[PDB]
Amino acid sequence: GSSGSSGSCQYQDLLSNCDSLKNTAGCEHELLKEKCKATCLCESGPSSG
User: Fold this and answer.
1) Cα–Cα distance between 43 and 41 in angstroms, integer?
2) Where located?
3) CA separation for the pair 41, 20 (Å, rounded)
4) What is the DSSP annotation of 5-41?
5) Is the dihedral of CA 27, 23, 20, 46 positive or negative?
6) Ramachandran area for residue 35 (φ above 0: left; ψ -120 to 50: alpha; else beta)
7) Looking at residue 43, what DSSP letter applies?
8) What is the DSSP letter of 3?
């Protein structure tokens, strides 16, 4: 099983190239503003906390 749900905080970015985007464009964008909630909020784990 290659295509599956792995590593997820909570939100589910509507887009796909959220990272690639945020990476540069940054969530600041309007496309990856909310639709890229994950990339925005979600990341991996307790980064700051």
Assistant:
1) 6
2) Secreted
3) 15
4) --S--S---SSSSHHHHHTTT-TTSSSSSSTTHHHHS
5) negative
6) alpha
7) S
8) S
